[PDB]
Specification:
The chain is of the alpha/beta class. The chain folds into 3 domains: 35 residues, Rubrerythrin, domain 2, CATH 2.20.28; 350 residues, HUPs (Rossmann fold, 3-Layer(aba) Sandwich), CATH 3.40.50.620; 138 residues, Isoleucyl-tRNA Synthetase, Domain 1. Helix content is 48%, strand content 15%. It contains 19 helices and 17 strands. Helix 12 runs antiparallel to helix 17. The protein starts with a strand and ends with a helix. The structure holds (1-amino-3-methylsulfanyl-propyl)-phosphinic acid and zinc ion. The site of zinc ion (ZN) has 8 residues, from loops. Its cofactor is Zn(2+).
């Protein structure tokens, strides 16, 4: 059995989970559930990204400690993910003792190895509040068009871009005082030293083609040293031997992947697995599911950091595109900027899991949630192709044959056609070609419904002396359903539980090789109901009003 550690990017603690986040967590959860079905040792890990100036300032506005605020958001996040049944083995935080010790360890090792440099820089400073200001916390009049109240390095009127130092009449967004340039010593990570190593990895053919192409652009532009320190006031980890200096959030964030796993091991009383997974000589596999906006950190800084601190590097990076709703970026004003919590007030988790999965592929292309198509696809595929296979046959079995399935398969050849597809469908789940897996599964479902139509059980049911025939027909349809739900198990956790309760059996990948014969099934209430555009409209309206 393989030993696999899978992660999703760590959500920032200063915002609610939305449909963008869910695309990633659902993609990874489907892959993880499939890996568990094939018998491998899997560790699905995540955590909240809880450090940084934005977080520090928000807590100060709310009138509470950053600890309290991140504690509340952590609970909010986990509640939403649980509602979508994301099966984490552990959900921790970057603000923990495990991450502190690991961040300090890696830093000391990098420093000892000569990968840390000291350098003084100039930056805007709020003399009143007594803190350096990140670009987005500086505002004034645009140098070009002279438009007042512009933020950061760009103007929202003429679209011009510039250094905040070029702003006319600058003002601290925090205190309102006029900021001034001030010097400060910073610590840098020498990424350029790992150039050749990284180019080799890019060239190995492991990463996605589109990712490798993006990386060549970055090497062409040239790698630079990375500033990894921030001055107090700051909500984060203090740098050893450097009073008033802290690790920049992006330095400790990925280490959080390690901290969450150490936390899991420690809680389990397991004293050997952390090293078995992170040591240089590991035979375990490590995968990170991430979005295209953070590929630079994960494909360049991260592998380099690990190499320089004597740890293993990622086995692979699985990148996905952005989520769009009705073809465009989520829009607050149109009500398409949807929170995960809000979605669950209107629809169930399985519906979205299925829709995203049917559109996902191994490439980094954007995924579009077309609301009109969502209603049509869910009703057509889940309700009318798969669930229909059970509902149209279970009634006769429970009422005419006391819930007992036939002693033999009515059509052995057809059943073999279904089991024969396991190899290709499983390879589809394995390679992340989710769209192909769903197409193959639904094609089988069409085959199953065609079989039922050919047999016409509603006709056989009303013809004298054909009881045995009816039971055989309906049992055959139910077994085809058994197979289909097995292939879809990684996708629809809840519908799967309802199906296993009806079938009186847990669905395992290898189990399909033994059909249910002379087997008792239970009566069942609706396994899945239809949805409609009225519900979609309510979702959009609720989302409009929430912002
Ligand atoms: C180590 S992954 C960190 C990801 C950022 N918090 P954001 O959700 O891109
Ligand atoms: Zn302007």
């Amino acid at each position: 059995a393989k030993k696999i550690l899978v992660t999703c990017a760590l959500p920032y603690a200063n915002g609610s989970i939305h449909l963008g986040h869910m695309l990633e967590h659902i993609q990874a959860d489907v892959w993880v559930r499939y890996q568990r079905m094939r018998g491998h040792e899997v560790n699905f890990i995540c955590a909240d990204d809880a450090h940084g100036t934005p977080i520090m300032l928000k807590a100060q506005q709310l009138g509470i400690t950053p600890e309290q605020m991140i504690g509340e958001m952590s609970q909010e996040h986990q509640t939403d993910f649980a509602g979508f049944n994301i099966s984490y083995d552990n959900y921790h935080s970057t603000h923990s003792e495990e991450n502190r010790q690991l961040s300090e360890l890696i830093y000391s090792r990098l420093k000892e190895n000569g990968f840390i440099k000291n350098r003084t820089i100039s930056q805007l400073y709020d003399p009143e509040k007594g803190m350096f200001l990140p670009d987005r916390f500086v505002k004034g009049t645009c140098p070009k068009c002279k438009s007042p109240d512009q933020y950061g390095d760009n103007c929202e009127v003429c679209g011009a871009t510039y250094s905040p130092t070029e702003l006319i009449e600058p003002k601290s967004v925090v205190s309102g005082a006029t900021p001034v340039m001030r010097d400060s010593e910073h610590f840098f990570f020498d990424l350029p030293s790992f150039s050749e190593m990284l180019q080799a990895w890019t060239r190995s053919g492991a990463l996605q083609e589109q990712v490798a192409n993006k990386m060549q652009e970055w090497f062409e532009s040239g790698l630079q040293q990375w500033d990894i320190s921030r001055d107090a006031p700051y909500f984060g980890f203090e740098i050893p031997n450097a009073p008033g200096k802290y690790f920049y959030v992006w330095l400790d964030a990925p280490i959080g992947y390690m901290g969450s796993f150490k936390n899991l091991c420690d809680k389990r009383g397991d004293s050997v697995s952390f090293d078995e997974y992170w040591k240089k000589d590991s035979t375990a596999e490590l995968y990170h599911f991430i979005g295209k906006d953070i590929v630079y950190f994960h494909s360049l800084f991260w592998p380099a950091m690990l190499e320089g601190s004597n740890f293993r590097k990622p086995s692979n990076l699985f990148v996905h595109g952005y989520v769009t709703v009705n073809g465009a970026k989520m829009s607050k004003s149109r009500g398409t900027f949807i929170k995960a919590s809000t979605w669950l007030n209107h629809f169930d988790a399985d519906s979205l899991r299925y829709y995203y999965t049917a559109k996902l592929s191994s490439r980094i292309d954007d995924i579009d949630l077309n609301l009109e198509d969502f209603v049509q696809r869910v009703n057509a595929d889940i309700v009318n192709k798969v669930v229909n296979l059970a509902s149209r046959n279970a009634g006769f079995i429970n009422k005419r044959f006391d819930g007992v399935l036939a002693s033999e398969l009515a059509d052995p050849q057809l059943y073999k056609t279904f089991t024969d597809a396991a190899e290709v469908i499983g390879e589809a789940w394995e390679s992340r070609e989710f769209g192909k897996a769903v197409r193959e599964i639904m094609a089988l479902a069409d085959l199953a419904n065609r079989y039922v139509d050919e047999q016409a059980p509603w006709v056989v049911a009303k013809q004298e002396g054909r009881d045995a025939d009816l039971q055989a027909i309906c049992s055959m349809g139910i077994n085809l359903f058994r197979v289909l739900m097995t292939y879809l198990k990684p996708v629809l956790p809840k519908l799967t539980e309802r199906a296993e309760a009806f079938l009186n059996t847990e669905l395992t990948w290898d189990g399909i090789q033994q059909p249910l014969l002379g087997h008792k099934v239970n009566p069942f209430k609706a396994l899945y109901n239809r949805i409609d555009m009225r519900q979609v409209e309510a979702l959009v309206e609720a989302s409009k009003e929430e912002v």
